[PDB]
Structure formats: structure tokens, C-alpha cells
Amino acid sequence: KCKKTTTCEPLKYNICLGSVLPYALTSTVLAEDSSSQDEVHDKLSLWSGLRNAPRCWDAIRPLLCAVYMPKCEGGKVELPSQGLCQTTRVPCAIVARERGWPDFLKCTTDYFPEGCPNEVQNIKFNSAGQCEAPLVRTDNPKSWYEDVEGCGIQCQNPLFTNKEHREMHIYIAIFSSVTIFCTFFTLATFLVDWKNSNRYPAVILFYVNACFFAGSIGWLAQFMDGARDEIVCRGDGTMRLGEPTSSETLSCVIIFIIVYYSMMSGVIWFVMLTYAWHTSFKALSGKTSYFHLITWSIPFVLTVAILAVAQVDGDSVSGICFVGYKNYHYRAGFVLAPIGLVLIGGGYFLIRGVMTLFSARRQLADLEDNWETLNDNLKVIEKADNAAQVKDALTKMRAAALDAQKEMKDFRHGFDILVGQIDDALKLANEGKVKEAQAAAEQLKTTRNAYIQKYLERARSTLSKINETMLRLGIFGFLAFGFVLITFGCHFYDFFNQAEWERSFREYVLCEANVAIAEQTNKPIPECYIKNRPSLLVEKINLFAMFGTGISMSTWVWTKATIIIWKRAWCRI
Ligand SMILES: CC1=C2C[C@H]3[C@@H](CC=C4C[C@@H](O)CC[C@@]43C)[C@@H]2CC[C@]12O[C@@H]1C[C@H](C)CN[C@H]1[C@H]2C
Numbered sequence: 001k002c003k004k005t006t007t008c009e010p011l012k013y014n015i016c017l018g019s020v021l022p023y024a025l026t027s028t029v030l031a032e033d034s035s036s037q038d039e040v041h042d043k044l045s046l047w048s049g050l051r052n053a054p055r056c057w058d059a060i061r062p063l064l065c066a067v068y069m070p071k072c073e074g075g076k077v078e079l080p081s082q083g084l085c086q087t088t089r090v091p092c093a094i095v096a097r098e099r100g101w102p103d104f105l106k107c108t109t110d111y112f113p114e115g116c117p118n119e120v121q122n123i124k125f126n127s128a129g130q131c132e133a134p135l136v137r138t139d140n141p142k143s144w145y146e147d148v149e150g151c152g153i154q155c156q157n158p159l160f161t162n163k164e165h166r167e168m169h170i171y172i173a174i175f176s177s178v179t180i181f182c183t184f185f186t187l188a189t190f191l192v193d194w195k196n197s198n199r200y201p202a203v204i205l206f207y208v209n210a211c212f213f214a215g216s217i218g219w220l221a222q223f224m225d226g227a228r229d230e231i232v233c234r235g236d237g238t239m240r241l242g243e244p245t246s247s248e249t250l251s252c253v254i255i256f257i258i259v260y261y262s263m264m265s266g267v268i269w270f271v272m273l274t275y276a277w278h279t280s281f282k283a284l285s286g287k288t289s290y291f292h293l294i295t296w297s298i299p300f301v302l303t304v305a306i307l308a309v310a311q312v313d314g315d316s317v318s319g320i321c322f323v324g325y326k327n328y329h330y331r332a333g334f335v336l337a338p339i340g341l342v343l344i345g346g347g348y349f350l351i352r353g354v355m356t357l358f359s360a361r362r363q364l365a366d367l368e369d370n371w372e373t374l375n376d377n378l379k380v381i382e383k384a385d386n387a388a389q390v391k392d393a394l395t396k397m398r399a400a401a402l403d404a405q406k407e408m409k410d411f412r413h414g415f416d417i418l419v420g421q422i423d424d425a426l427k428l429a430n431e432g433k434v435k436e437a438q439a440a441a442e443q444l445k446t447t448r449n450a451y452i453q454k455y456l457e458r459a460r461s462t463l464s465k466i467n468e469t470m471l472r473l474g475i476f477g478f479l480a481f482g483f484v485l486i487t488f489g490c491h492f493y494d495f496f497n498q499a500e501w502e503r504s505f506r507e508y509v510l511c512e513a514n515v516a517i518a519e520q521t522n523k524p525i526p527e528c529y530i531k532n533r534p535s536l537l538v539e540k541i542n543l544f545a546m547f548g549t550g551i552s553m554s555t556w557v558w559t560k561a562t563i564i565i566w567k568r569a570w571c572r573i
């Protein structure tokens, strides 16, 4: 009979000599020189050396597959046919001459029964129609998926359909457009007033938006008539992976360089921003030429390193080329690490900045507290009947003014005068003279205005400036940290389940490989699908995060003080 009784075990390799196996279970019983599938793969590695003789190889492939890796299903293995074995004798006669034939490969009808249907005869090792979606026939051996011959891994992302591609593309369209013109607004502002806006750290924002403009450009590049497929796909319609490979158009690596470099410089400029703020608070342009070198060296070195390991991959959904898609331990290395370090540094100099801020914020408030005391005490003194209230309030005034006394010598002199006059009024009030002290408090009023009000209203305005700065730092801090937290979350999710998505994808590929033969042989065909895939909402979130940062830094230039600056250049008469 065409069937043999043995125990079916799973394939350790789902490929037979560059051809995908349409079945899932096999048996090592027919390979009489083998006992395990390791041995089988070894023997096939020995038979591999025959590939230098294509004339024989063509005819011996199917036999070798039907023998060493046969279909096992429900305790049965189908034995190869006599007709199949006879097609090996004539051309592979070389095997017979140099070392002879193995006894289990000799065409004795007990090993090869006559007229037996074989699953292998259906399989084509010249992949004319063998290549099955999500795979496409390419005859370039640099695009061949794993060990499969003639088949390449298709260009468009096989985890999301076109219905989702259009979606994400219009999403990225809108967002990146908002960013590309917001950053242009912010550039134009600091550019038209290049003479008056070129200061540090106000030019650091300009540099940030410059970077995030350059990047959004590369993000928009994929929307031209046929540019997307030029960036993402190879010449043979198979997605660009491990770029830059030899003899491929640099239409990918250029976009990668843009999107990555602009991004990284764009986030190191954050650290430079926080430092510049801190040192601005601590009091200059001595280190202003050294920030540059850092913010341009580090992204360069990183990008060059990525190009050195050649781990640029192409995504059709995003429509760009970026680091560490295929191998996700590179994305964590070149994206998550620099961003995290940026978060740490920028956060450090932020809190240092608000310490440098907090220390004065209390001082000015204390001065305001003393002035708050003086006025209300004068309010009580000027309008009182009992001469105990006058004594009391005068003492309190003395305490406050004394506490406030603790170009500068003039300021202290004023409070000398105030304390003195207050003590005079104290002497007057102690003796029970109510209205004499009350009248001697108007002296305190006019003196308060004359000698003290200057330095006070001088330091009255700063509490608005300082609080505004404090709250805008309150914006930037809890904004940037939120963005970093979110993008770290997304990247960590993908980082987490990319170990599973590849499993599911592979199983799916094998399934469709089964479907291929299952259809053109009038055999029952099983439905194939992806068990699990990346969430599109997560990618939505990440994009929203980075573009949201790109927009929020362009929002900074949005002031009413800016709007009028535009008029000066061309208002004329
Ligand atoms: C590759 C090769 C062969 C390896 C095959 C053998 C047929 C049977 C088996 C049994 C199986 O258990 C292990 C594999 C082995 C040995 C076949 C004969 C032809 C050739 O050996 C020649 C040696 C010669 C020096 C050069 N040319 C070499 C090749 C054409």
C-alpha cells in the first residue's frame, strides 16, 4: 500500500530544500539513515552539495523531500512512488557512479510502490506560482525570505490591510501637516527678526522647531506620486530590510537620516534648553558655541552607527524608513535610550532651575509680607480711639520694618529712617498721647512712600514675571514628562509583543503555504488568519505623542507680542 504505520511528529523545519512544506507533521521512518529530524537535516545538508548539478538536482529534490521529510497524518506516512523514483535514476546517475545509491533510495517497489499518489509531485521547486501571499516571487537572492528559494517577503505591511493603510496615511497626513506649518510659522518668526530674535536661549527653541521641521519634511516625502513605494519597497517589490544593502537606491536611507537625525538633535536641544534656562536663572555666551557641537555630534554619531550596523527597515504604514523594526532590540537601543537620557538630564536642570527659582520666590514674597504688615498697621493707627492700639500696631510695624531691613545702602537708610520715626511715635504712644502719635504716623506714611516704595514697586512686578515663568515651566515639565512616558509606553508595548507577533506571522505564512497546494489540487483548504497583530491605536498614540511635541514647541512662539513684530518689516508709510 501507499501508506505506512508510524507515529507523526511535528516538523522541526517547515522548509524542504528552499520549498515550503504544505504539511505540518512528518516521520523519520523512511529515512533509514536517520532516526531524528536533526539527522534528517544533516543528511539533507549532505545532499545539498549536489546543487552544483542543476540537471540532477531538479529531479532529485522531490524524491529527497518525499523520503526524508514526508507527510505524516494520523499515524500514516505516504511512501514515494515508483514513477517518482524512476525520474531520478536517469539524470542523477552520477550518484550511482561515485558512491552508489542508499538502499532506501533504490527503486525497489517495496520502498517505492507503483502508482502511489505523492504530495510532493504537486509542489513546484521552480516557484512559478509557488510564491504565496504574503510572499511575492523575486529572483533576487537578497530578498528571499529565510531559506526559501524564489519567494520574497512582500513589500506592504502584511499585518495591516489597505483599509488601515489609507487610515494611518491620512492620520499622519493631517498631523505632520499641522507640524510642518506650525514649525514654519515658528521659524519665520525668529527669522524675519533675525537681528532682534537671535539670542540664547530663545534661539534654542528656533533650533528645536528647525529640526522638527526638517523631520516632518521627510515624513511628508512619502505622499508624492509613487515616492512611498520608492522609499519602503526594494526594486523587486519586497520591503526594504537591513538597509543600506549594496546596489539599492538610497531613496530609503535618506529619509531615515532625515527623520532620525532631526528627531534626535530635536530632543538633545531640550537638554540644552533646560541647561540654558538654569544658567540664566543662576545669575553666558561663553558656552553658547559648545552646545551646538554636542547637539550636532551625538545625532550624527548615532545615525552613522545605525548605518554601520545597517539596521534601517522600511514601513509602509508609517511610510518611512526607520531603525529597528525587524530587530526590536535596536529600536530600544537607539530611540528609547537617548530619549530617556534626555528626559533625565532635562528634568534635572528643570528642577535645578525651579530650585534656583524657588529660593528667590520666597524672598520677594517675604518682602511683600512686610509691606503688607506696614500698610494695614497704618490703617489701624490712623483710625483708632484707644491709645493701646497705637502702641501695639506701632510695635508690630517696628518688627515688620526691622525684618524688611535685613545703591543698596540707600535702601537700608530708608528703613533706618522708618524704624527711627516709628520709635519716636512709639515714645509718643507710650505716654498715652493718642492723636500726637496718630499724627506722627502720617510722617511714617510720607516717609514710607518717599524712601521705601521705590524698591518695593520695583520688586512688586517681579512676582508676576517669576510666577509666569514658574507656571510655564510647570507646563513644559509635566508636558514633556507626559510625552516621554507615553512614547516609552508605546515602544515598550511593541517591544513586549513583537516576540509573539513574529510567531503568529510565521504560522500564518506556513498556513498560506499549505493553502497554495491545497487549492490547485482540489483538496480541502483551511482558512488562514493572523492570530494577533500590533494595535493601530497604539501607533496612533505614539504618532500623536511625537507630533504633539513637535507642535507644542511651535506653540511657544504664539504671543501677542509676536504679531506686531510682523508689521514693522513692511508697514512702510
Ligand atoms: C555529495 C555527494 C553525495 C553525498 C551522498 C552521496 C549519496 C549517498 C549518501 C548517503 C547519505 O547518508 C549521506 C550523503 C551521501 C554520502 C552522494 C554521492 C555524490 C557526492 O559524493 C561525491 C564525492 C566526490 C569526492 C565529489 N562529488 C561528490 C558528490 C557528487
Ligand SMILES: CC1=C2C[C@H]3[C@@H](CC=C4C[C@@H](O)CC[C@@]43C)[C@@H]2CC[C@]12O[C@@H]1C[C@H](C)CN[C@H]1[C@H]2C
Pocket (backbone or CB within 6 Å): 153, 157, 158, 159, 314, 315, 317, 318, 325, 326, 327, 494, 498, 501, 502, 505, 534, 539
Ligand atoms: C511586519 C513587521 C513589523 C511591522 C511593525 C514592526 C514593529 C514596528 C512597527 C512600527 C509601526 O508604526 C508600524 C508597524 C511596524 C513597522 C514589525 C517588525 C516585524 C515585522 O517585520 C518582520 C520582517 C521579518 C523578516 C519577518 N517578520 C516580520 C514582521 C513580524
